[PDB]
Amino acid sequence: FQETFKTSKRAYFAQIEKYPKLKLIDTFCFFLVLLGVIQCTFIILIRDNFPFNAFLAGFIICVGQFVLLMSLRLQLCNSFPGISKNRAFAEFIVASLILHFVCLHFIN
Amino acid sequence: EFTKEIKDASAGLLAAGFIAIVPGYISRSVAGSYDNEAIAITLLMVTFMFWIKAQKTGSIMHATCAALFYFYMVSAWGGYVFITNLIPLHVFLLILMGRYSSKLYSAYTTWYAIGTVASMQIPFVGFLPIRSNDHMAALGVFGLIQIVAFGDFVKGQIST
Amino acid sequence: KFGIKPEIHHIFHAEPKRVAKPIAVIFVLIIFITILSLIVTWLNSCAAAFNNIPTGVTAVYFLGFIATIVGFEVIFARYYLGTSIFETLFSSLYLGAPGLLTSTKFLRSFG
Amino acid sequence: MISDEQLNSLAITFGIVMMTLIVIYHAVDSTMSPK
Amino acid sequence: LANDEYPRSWEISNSWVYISAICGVIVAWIFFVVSFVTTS
Numbered sequence: 505f506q507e508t509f510k511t512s513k514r515a516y517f518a519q520i521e522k523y524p525k526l527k528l529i530d531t532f533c534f535f536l537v538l539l540g541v542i543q544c545t546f547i548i549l550i551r552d553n554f555p556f557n558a559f560l561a562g563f564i565i566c567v568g569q570f571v572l573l574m575s576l577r578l579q580l581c582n583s584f585p586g587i588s589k590n591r592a593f594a595e596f597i598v599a600s601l602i603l604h605f606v607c608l609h610f611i612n
Numbered sequence: 613e614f615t616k617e618i619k620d621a622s623a624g625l626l627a628a629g630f631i632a633i634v635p636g637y638i639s640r641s642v643a644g645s646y647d648n649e650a651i652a653i654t655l656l657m658v659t660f661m662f663w664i665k666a667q668k669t670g671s672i673m674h675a676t677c678a679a680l681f682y683f684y685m686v687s688a689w690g691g692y693v694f695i696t697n698l699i700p701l702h703v704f705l706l707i708l709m710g711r712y713s714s715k716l717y718s719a720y721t722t723w724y725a726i727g728t729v730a731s732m733q734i735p736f737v738g739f740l741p742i743r744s745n746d747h748m749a750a751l752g753v754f755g756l757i758q759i760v761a762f763g764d765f766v767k768g769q770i771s772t
Numbered sequence: 773k774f775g776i777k778p779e780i781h782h783i784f785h786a787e788p789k790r791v792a793k794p795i796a797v798i799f800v801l802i803i804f805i806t807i808l809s810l811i812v813t814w815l816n817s818c819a820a821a822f823n824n825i826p827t828g829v830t831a832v833y834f835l836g837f838i839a840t841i842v843g844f845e846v847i848f849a850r851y852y853l854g855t856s857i858f859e860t861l862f863s864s865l866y867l868g869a870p871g872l873l874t875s876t877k878f879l880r881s882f883g
Numbered sequence: 884m885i886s887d888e889q890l891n892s893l894a895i896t897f898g899i900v901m902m903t904l905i906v907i908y909h910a911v912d913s914t915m916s917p918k
Numbered sequence: 919l920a921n922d923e924y925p926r927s928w929e930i931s932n933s934w935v936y937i938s939a940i941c942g943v944i945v946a947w948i949f950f951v952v953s954f955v956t957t958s
């Protein structure tokens with residue numbers, strides 16, 4: 505397993521250095537995970553989940569943003585047949601500012 | 613427009629001609645009936661159309677439309693459970709058949725992440741899409757696909 | 773009960789209890805410092821900075837695109853402060869129509 | 884108001900016209916399109 | 919009780935950590951979108 509890790513780490517860390525705009529994505533996905541964990545830690549420490557709709561609104565806005573970022577990264581690494589690298593952004597923006605409105609309506 | 617995907621446009625008009633006059637659909641949409649099914653089958657088709665258009669192409673904008681029309685069907689009828697348990701079955705059958713691609717990931721994850729949080733906004737549905745057994749299938753497949761994508765990366769850099 | 777009947781009162785249910793303020797304040801400070809850390813990582817550490825910037829008419833389209841992206845989130849934030857849904861819809865339809873054109877013009881011009 | 888037999892005839896004529904134009908379209912497309 | 923008469927999401931003290939997360943994700947997303955079209 506050591507050989508696989510050795511041959512994958514340098515490959516990924518060279519790919520992320522050849523393309524700069526693949527470092528914007530992942531270091532924005534990573535921290536999202538942290539946010540999720542933090543919220544979970546909170547519900548663990550305060551063992552009562554009184555506003556459960558608020559917890560869901562604060563956790564979905566992380567999960568459903570991580571998945572959209574991952575889809576954008578996949579569609580930028582090697583684009584899909586019909587759609588170009590410029591629809592990949594103007595569709596991610598629309599889906600993101602629809603999810604944001606849904607998650608702002610959920611929490612109130 | 614949904615049969616225009618499965619085959620050429622010439623084979624879709626026939627389907628329309630069938631569904632315009634057929635007693636199995638006329639029975640519940642007669643001139644006087646004002647039930648939920650009156651509006652609940654149209655959306656049933658439209659969502660499926662977009663899902664095909666989203667799964668066949670892989671775009672995100674064709675899965676957000678499917679999520680929006682699935683929220684509209686959730687608001688309009690209590691038979692959304694059928695879609696919620698049929699789309700994951702399609703994705704799963706494509707997973708184990710060995711036809712996983714980078715299009716299923718984007719399409720399904722966008723559809724789920726938007727449709728579930730949108731369908732939670734109906735006061736009658738409430739928190740069921742995370743509590744009831746019916747919707748659990750969808751959630752399961754969500755987790756499953758998150759694994760498979762990572763597995764694909766391993767295939768990219770590991771001998772078969 | 774010809775003469776008189778005993779008094780009756782309704783025993784309510786206890787309301788669900790909130791949590792102490794200091795814990796929430798600590799957990800808000802943690803999220804704030806995390807966001808600031810992400811911003812600092814973007815700016816300086818990861819060397820991901822503003823290499824090329826649009827100028828002239830492409831810069832005006834850029835300003836329009838930013839104006840649209842920020843205006844939608846201002847609309848959503850104002851809707852989160854008890855604004856009517858219909859008003860939000862009208863304010864979004866009066867901003868998408870110019871904003872869609874400007875954003876498409878920018879994304880086709882710049883690439 | 885329109886009677887009931889007149890409406891029955893109208894519905895049957897609409898269905899026949901639809902089912903004939905569909906076949907005309909399909910038989911034009913089968914030949915004229917590159918196969 | 920109608921939806922408009924429940925206590926707001928900021929009057930509660932248990933849910934001040936679930937609004938900071940949303941505001942932070944929104945701010946980070948805005949800055950990300952801005953920096954994406956301004957980088958080689």
Ligand SMILES: *[C@@H]1O[C@H](CO)[C@@H](O[C@@H]2O[C@H](CO)[C@@H](O[C@@H]3O[C@H](CO[C@H]4O[C@H](CO)[C@@H](O)[C@H](O)[C@@H]4O)[C@@H](O)[C@H](O[C@H]4O[C@H](CO)[C@@H](O)[C@H](O)[C@@H]4O[C@H]4O[C@H](CO)[C@@H](O)[C@H](O)[C@@H]4O[C@H]4O[C@H](CO)[C@@H](O)[C@H](O)[C@@H]4O)[C@@H]3O)[C@H](O)[C@H]2NC(C)=O)[C@H](O)[C@H]1NC(C)=O
Nearest residue numbers: 736738773776777778779780781782783784785786787919
């Ligand atoms: C669907 O429709 C159906 C039918 O329409 C609905 O069913 C009805 O629901 C009603 C409410 O749930 C219910 O009413 C209650 O029935 C209880 C039955 O008790 C039986 O046993 C006792 C002995 O133990 C018998 O005396 C009694 O006759 C029955 O045979 C009653 O016990 C309830 O009485 C209490 O409430 C009434 C109304 O307020 C009071 O007048 C009465 O004195 C009791 O009050 C005590 O409890 C209340 C609880 O809120 C307190 O507020 C109050 O201050 C009293 O408190 C004292 O006692 C408690 C308990 O010991 C103690 O803790 C406290 O300190 C005090 O000492 C009441 O009568 C109907 O019977 C029922 N009908 C049928 C046919 O089933 C159904 O709800 C509908 N569904 C929905 C979802 O709405």
Ligand SMILES: CC(C)=CCC/C(C)=C/CC/C(C)=C/CC/C(C)=C/CC/C(C)=C/CC/C(C)=C/CC/C(C)=C/CC/C(C)=C/CC/C(C)=C/C=C/C(C)=C/CC[C@@H](C)CCOP(=O)(O)O
Nearest residue numbers: 536537540566567570690691693694697749752753755756
């Ligand atoms: C932290 C952050 C921020 C980010 C991190 C990253 C990230 C993205 C995280 C995301 C979250 C994660 C990671 C989650 C993890 C979870 C996991 C990994 C799980 C394991 C996987 C499994 C196990 C898969 C396998 C499926 C599986 C369980 C299968 C078992 C369950 C099952 C099979 C249940 C039952 C199936 C069933 C019942 C099927 C058929 C049912 C149907 C079709 C019903 C339809 C009925 C109809 C038609 C109803 C219509 C009703 C109307 C007609 C009438 C209505 O009435 P009216 O009111 O009049 O309208």
Ligand SMILES: [Mg+2]
Nearest residue numbers: 647648649690
């Ligand atoms: Mg019914």
